[PDB]
Amino acid sequence: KWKLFKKIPKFLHSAKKF
């Protein structure tokens, strides 16, 4: 399987920054 939409770490970096 694949998940490039999860490879982006800067994304989860905003999750905790929100």
Q: Which residue has the tokens 């982006």?
A: 8
How far is it, in rounded angstroms, from Cα 12 to Cα 15? 5
Q: Rounded to 5 degrees, what are φ and ψ at 11?
A: -70, -55
| Separation CA 2–CA 14 (nearest Å) | 22
CA–CA distance, 4 with 18 (Å, rounded to integer): 22
Neighbours of 16 (CB within 10 A): 6
- Give the C-alpha separation, 11 to 6, whole Å: 8
The two three-digit tokens of residue 7, written as one number? 């490879």
User: Tokens 């800067």 identify what position?
Assistant: 10
**H or E stretch at 12:** helix 9-16
